[PDB]
Scaffold this active site. Sequence first.
Site, short mmCIF file in Angstrom:
data_model
loop_
_atom_site.label_atom_id
_atom_site.label_comp_id
_atom_site.label_asym_id
_atom_site.label_seq_id
_atom_site.Cartn_x
_atom_site.Cartn_y
_atom_site.Cartn_z
N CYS B 150 15.85 -6.21 8.44
CA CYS B 150 15.38 -4.95 7.89
C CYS B 150 14.24 -4.42 8.72
O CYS B 150 14.17 -3.23 9.00
CB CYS B 150 14.93 -5.14 6.44
N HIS B 177 4.76 -5.86 4.68
CA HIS B 177 6.01 -6.17 3.98
C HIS B 177 5.90 -6.26 2.48
O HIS B 177 4.84 -6.54 1.95
CB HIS B 177 6.63 -7.45 4.53
#
Lengths: 333, 333, 333, 333
Positions: B150, B177
């Site tokens: 991702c 994140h």
Amino acid sequence: KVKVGVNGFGRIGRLVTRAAFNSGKVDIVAINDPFIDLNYMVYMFQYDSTHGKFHGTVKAENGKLVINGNPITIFQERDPSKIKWGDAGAEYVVESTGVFTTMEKAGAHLQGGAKRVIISAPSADAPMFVMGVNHEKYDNSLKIISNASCTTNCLAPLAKVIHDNFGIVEGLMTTVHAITATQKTVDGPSGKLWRDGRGALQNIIPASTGAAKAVGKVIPELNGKLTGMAFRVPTANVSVVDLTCRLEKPAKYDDIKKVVKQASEGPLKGILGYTEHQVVSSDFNSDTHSSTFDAGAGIALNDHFVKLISWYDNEFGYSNRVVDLMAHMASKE
Amino acid sequence: KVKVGVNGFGRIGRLVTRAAFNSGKVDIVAINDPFIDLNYMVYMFQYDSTHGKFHGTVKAENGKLVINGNPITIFQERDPSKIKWGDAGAEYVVESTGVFTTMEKAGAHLQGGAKRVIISAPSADAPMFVMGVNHEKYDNSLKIISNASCTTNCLAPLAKVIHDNFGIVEGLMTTVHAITATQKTVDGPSGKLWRDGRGALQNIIPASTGAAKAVGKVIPELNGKLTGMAFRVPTANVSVVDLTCRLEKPAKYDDIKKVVKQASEGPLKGILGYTEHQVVSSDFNSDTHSSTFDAGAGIALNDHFVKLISWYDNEFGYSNRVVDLMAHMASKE
Amino acid sequence: KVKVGVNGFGRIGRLVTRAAFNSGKVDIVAINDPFIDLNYMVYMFQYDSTHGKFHGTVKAENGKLVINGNPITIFQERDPSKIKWGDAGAEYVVESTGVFTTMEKAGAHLQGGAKRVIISAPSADAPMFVMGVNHEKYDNSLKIISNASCTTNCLAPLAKVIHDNFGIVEGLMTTVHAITATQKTVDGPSGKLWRDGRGALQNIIPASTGAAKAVGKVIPELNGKLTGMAFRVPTANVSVVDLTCRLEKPAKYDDIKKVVKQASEGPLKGILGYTEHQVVSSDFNSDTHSSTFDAGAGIALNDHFVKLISWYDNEFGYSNRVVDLMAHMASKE
Amino acid sequence: KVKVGVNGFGRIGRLVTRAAFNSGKVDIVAINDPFIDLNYMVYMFQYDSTHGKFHGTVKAENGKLVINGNPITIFQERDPSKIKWGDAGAEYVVESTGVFTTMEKAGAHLQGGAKRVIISAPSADAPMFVMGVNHEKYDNSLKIISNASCTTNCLAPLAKVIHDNFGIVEGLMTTVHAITATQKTVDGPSGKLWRDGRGALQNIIPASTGAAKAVGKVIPELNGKLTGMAFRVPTANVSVVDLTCRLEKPAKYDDIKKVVKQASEGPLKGILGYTEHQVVSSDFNSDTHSSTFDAGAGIALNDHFVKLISWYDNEFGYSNRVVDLMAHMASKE
């Protein structure tokens, strides 16, 4: 000792005084809060969610906040000219409210009778003296001083060590900041920044920080080479500063690790700290260290291009440094 | 159409299938989960806290998960050799569990009968084809492909546009994140990283990410010029990538803003997106955009030295891109 | 003194030992963790996000965890029969892992050589002796004892005082529990309860608690009159118990407030605590008090029908009570 | 249709209007916000972290907020007498700011020209008409109506069904409320309640709620038999109400489950909803249902003594009910 008055019982004001009674370096004679009553003051000081419960006795007798056996005069005056700072026998007065950053506003405290005023928020006009970087440039003549900002207080000691040792041609800083009072719990109307009005708990808020540009002021050489940005995340007390910089002279990351360690154990002691452990933000909670370098986190692409990670307890470390500033100022006097 | 089997009903597996039925581009014939029962599968698919409730009908009749009127065969086999992929008539099979990244492990699905295997996790040996960057380099001969990560999926489209337009001599990436399944709720024993064992809710976890080093693989020129680090913060669904890079050729930030905008509206559409609004992480929730550039947040010290900010819904955007990969692969066939 | 071995270095195990070295009441001779290495043990013990950093020295010399100058033997054995408890010279052994609740499983520690085994989790077969309620019913003959649960430990002291003073015909308990290790960070597969698999950070998880039914065991009269439910919310360390009960004899809320206060200052000291302040969950963090009654929060509809609020630090208070149990057991011996 | 003006663009005001344009039942002609500019209004309406992004077009042309093709007149007047409600051609005006609860303050809107004023906050003097409980008691003569509170809106439908079917001698309510705008991000000075000043993210705040006492007003028989308390926890959008009550006539929990289900599928449709699934707070996000009963969570000690659990999206469900109120009022006219 030096008798210190506090203006504003906000997060900074409460912790500046907690640090003062703990460290012991400055005796807090007086606190002024336009809106907070004495009974409320005992409550706020006694219990802090971020910093645990105050150890000692906080009591409210005869209009005096008696903390650790020392009574503190309490004032309820909105305008600083009205505050009787001289009557309170306060040599130094710490502006914390933050709405009086400009030196004129600060000088209202001066007429109160405070010999010197210290600004816990960055002030453009006032000279800024971060502890451990440019503190020795303080002179008796100056009556209004600023301690810059928590973010700048963290950045500059690390910058002072790296820039001197290897040189920094250019630098960019990313700070994962912790939640502030400004950030609303849910989406709310903040006119200035639409970004901060958005709720703190569920969002990640990208804001603009002038702390890097303030480091350029405190360290002259570095001026014009550091700028930055900040992300507000849902963490209550500790934040991390990240300096991505291109050195002037080559440096292996283990050399960077060494020079910081040497500085931490020598002159930048307390001001700077070096940890090799697998630390996380919570470990740095209730820290005195304005800046704590993390060795493991930072990754260097080249000897010239390096990323440096430093964790700072924004609320506590800054407040302790304010106390240290004043102690240094008293010694200079 | 192409019939796609899913291995693992984890976060990636569930959302890969949600995207598939929503987009409509791939029909999910089969799902295999060693531990999750069919009744549980209906529950997990129907309700997702991060992504709202699935719209449509998910039901469990005769051993088949009937989503939107389409029955999905369900398998309970721990080893992929045992899974009857051919009997399920699945052309493509998406490895999502993540414990089978290596191409040998992937080829067990191939013996099942799946013509091609796709890895939703970065794989060293497998070739990695991020959509919108190196996807056109795919050829029919390859049977095992990885969609990288991702973080890499977000980074590379932005890197592709900036590197081509201005050049990138060197780059460093910081990613804020969002919480993952790996991060324990409270302090817990993670043997590999002691950092992640620490609790997600109260900490800020600095971890190491190979996503920048993976971008160097997908974009050959950039290889060896990008490395990074990540901070795990308590945010449920969306994360932000920050690329601090020194351009090769000068660039004004408004020029950077233009080229990204042009790319977003042209060939990198959907893959990349440009927003000038005062956006926050929540605004990017349930996004299809693998990378969304934020213009306001990024600050450039010099024309050469620039900081670029791009927000990615890690769970949703990636999953949509996996679906897009397979559709592209089918077209190439 | 009594030498105590700990089985499992989990949240309970770590804090049971922290309490032991702090209180000083029991000396921890040995710790066994099948999966956690000695180096990791130093890390886990030294830093706790919920409870601050351990004060003292934790070091790893010659295979011994030296905490506060006392070396602790370390064992890596999965099955308790294999653990050399007798060789470690441990009189009492605290089962904490929780997978060995049944008395047979507990007796494996007994063959190791531990004179007595204590279960930090509620055990059906084992007799349960909550401190300050039924502790004086302990006899030397019993070798396996359970300290019940954190929730029951909070409930029972309050129940003991109210039931004796006014009587309780019937009662229902709602507990706003804090996050546990069981709760996954994001939606995850928990087969037993589909409720807990759902992510802790964004959800409010209604679970079933047998703690009220366990209070009925520890206090015989009350048995069959207390049942409950729990809500798991995103709070890291402290939870609150709420007992809605219909008294047998009338009671004004100020009478309820008095009897609890009298109990707190007399025999249920430490076990129970009464606070009139405007407290919040954070104020109760790192508490020793298994139960702390809040006077302000509880509201009574009628003299007969009353709601009682009591806050408990689930992780710390329970662990301190386990230490107290063992000290009491040693005195009885 | 009925043209509705909104006073205040707060959380309630924004969502009242979102519901209005979505449901379609009332057309929002005018919005007044003393402090929020038109450009800011577009931003606030377009993006909501708790409720996803508004679907449709929100634009700002010629001083009009054009939502879904309908232009809304915008007013910037602090005092409601000054607002030109009649000129805006608004039949009904929804007071949402909450600082104008008293009927006199409400009548300032009436002089503006609004035929009727509706108060989205509980008002003592104004009659309160919760939808689905006492709505049919509304008459044309009344010009100022209150929709009570989100908590009361959830409680009363459940109370109406249980009280009628089995009877309720006495009841006590515990609500695990979600974070509000009132709760500060970190410890802050709230003079009224010292409890709420404490930070929302890290605390669990026990507050007092009059919602149960308001249910006693809306349902006359129940008056004087319901009182309660609330806990503010760090959850962004959904809260849960818990009614512990002693029935007058015996009831098995499966009978309780049946009568609620029958009510949900019959007259209390939308107003009340029954779910047997293993639901969590997130599942109820963006719900229209003012009250949703959960069957699994509630536990009954005796046929007479029962605990009932009902989840309500506080922000969305209430706002939808306000729209429904006005539609009903228009029909009565």
